[PDB]
Design a protein around this ligand. Sequence first.
Ligand code: VTJ
Ligand code: VTJ
Lengths: 296, 298
Amino acid sequence: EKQILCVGLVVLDVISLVDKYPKEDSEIRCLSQRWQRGGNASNSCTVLSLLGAPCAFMGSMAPGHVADFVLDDLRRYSVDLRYTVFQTTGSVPIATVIINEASGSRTILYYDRSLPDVSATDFEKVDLTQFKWIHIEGRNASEQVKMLQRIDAHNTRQPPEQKIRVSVEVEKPREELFQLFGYGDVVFVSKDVAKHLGFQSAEEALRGLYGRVRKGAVLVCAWAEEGADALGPDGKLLHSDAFPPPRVVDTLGAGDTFNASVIFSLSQGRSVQEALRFGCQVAGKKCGLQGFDGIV
Amino acid sequence: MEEKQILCVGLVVLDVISLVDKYPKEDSEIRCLSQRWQRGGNASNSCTVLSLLGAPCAFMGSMAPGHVADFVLDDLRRYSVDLRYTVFQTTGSVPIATVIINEASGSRTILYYDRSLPDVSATDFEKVDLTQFKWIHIEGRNASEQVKMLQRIDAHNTRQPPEQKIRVSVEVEKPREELFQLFGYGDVVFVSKDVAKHLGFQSAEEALRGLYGRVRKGAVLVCAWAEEGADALGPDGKLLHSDAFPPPRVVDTLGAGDTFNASVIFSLSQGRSVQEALRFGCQVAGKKCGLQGFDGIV
Ligand SMILES: CS(=O)(=O)c1cccc2[nH]c3c(c12)CCCc1ccc(CN2CC[C@](O)(c4ccccc4)C2)cc1-3
Ligand SMILES: CS(=O)(=O)c1cccc2[nH]c3c(c12)CCCc1ccc(CN2CC[C@](O)(c4ccccc4)C2)cc1-3
């Protein structure tokens, strides 16, 4: 059966759950601490798996103890490991995450490991007949554009029913990533990217950036407690309010939960308006739980 | 018979250090300057310093087998710390502490995670042949069990001539009510600035005057107060002081308190006066604050 492919990076999150944000130069006792497999594309596979959609993860990996944890973690979620790109240099990146249970905040201290990125040559090895949807987490944009051109070229030879749907996420405010707006059926732009571009709402960001998307594409922008908006070729702005839980305890991976839920809903043939609502409902539910498991 | 060792009873921690250029704002993503794995724990860090200073030492702590235990045991072993009294546990794991070191300000922020590792009990301590040690330092943790260990040392000392008596030090570093009974034990009592402030004291002198009535007859109460230096108070009621010796650039204060304690113990265990030991404690700890880790102190 056709799967959803997620192309991105896997990070190991070292999470410290606290009752208050630590003051500089103090010693605080953690409520709990845990290891969790992170990374945008990687979190989206976890959510797609929990929602019941067969999915695969394509990312760079370096052999060892961290890879054993990560691959074992993916296996627990039946996330297909076929396209794992093993590297001979670098390590899996580690992120230190402070989660403030009282405010719901997540603070990340990121450590780059010098792990080589998935290249266009690595992607050429992917048998595209096995996938109905391919999601690409924007990172090494010049290589990723070649991957997207490979998908576009495959799609020209397929009937409309057999075309692979594509989504791209532009989550970091890096100039190199903005070329990715012109690719994919669904383009996810983060609130962080929108604010760095001068936009003060999801609606402003969509109207201001729609000119950059491919003909027929849907541009999506989640705006935390203000909910999420989308804009398609008909010019109709779509919106869903946020659905915050009674107590916000964990926002780590909330954006990834939203993206996976929108992809899931759209792949099942739901409207963009239904997909936005579903995204907000699942991410909102996630924000009231530690991790992802409790969403189901 | 060989030179007698200094035994440190405490816990070994794995420090997961994030070196940063600024203190992270809540809900933001920051890139670390570097990240490293370092063996921590108060008594464990004091062993590192005693070893670097050249004093033979031994560490008694709980351990759970695994990758973390292999890293911390190999690290202690590189410092020739005697580990024959390591208590291997069948439940729990070696604790992990997340440390944020702000290179710009010289701060250290600790997020500590108790990994349900059982503590060293009084029954575990009963197995220690005390004839090996000239000094026993106890990092306050499971106080009711530790009080029994201290009573065992006191009982051993009643049967020994004054030259053969084992000197004892205790550290009360965490502001936990259970630990305050430990002030009544040991020849030397270390009280942290954190404990003193939690108890309402605003200076080392106030803390020493305010807490001296709780120490054993003849004990020396010691309190280091970061950039204000360190003070000590003994049975004559004379408050002793050393100013701090700050480095030109304060880069790493993680384990500075442990550097001070080990240096004071080292100095007193070598017949130096309390005044000489305070000065030495500030000199070594002040030097440590100017460098990442402990090795550069020598
Ligand atoms: C798809 S979605 O569901 O729209 C979504 C996607 C991505 C991220 C998201 N964040 C949040 C939502 C959300 C929406 C519902 C839950 C929620 C409640 C409260 C806050 C606001 N809080 C969270 C810490 C906070 O940002 C903070 C900052 C600094 C100090 C203390 C707290 C202030 C955000 C969200
Ligand atoms: C045995 S000892 O040597 O007395 C000692 C024992 C234990 C801890 C120690 N800390 C420091 C010393 C020290 C003494 C000399 C070096 C020094 C210089 C400057 C500061 C002050 N800095 C360090 C972060 C700081 O306290 C901070 C607080 C909040 C925000 C940002 C930084 C502001 C402390 C020390």
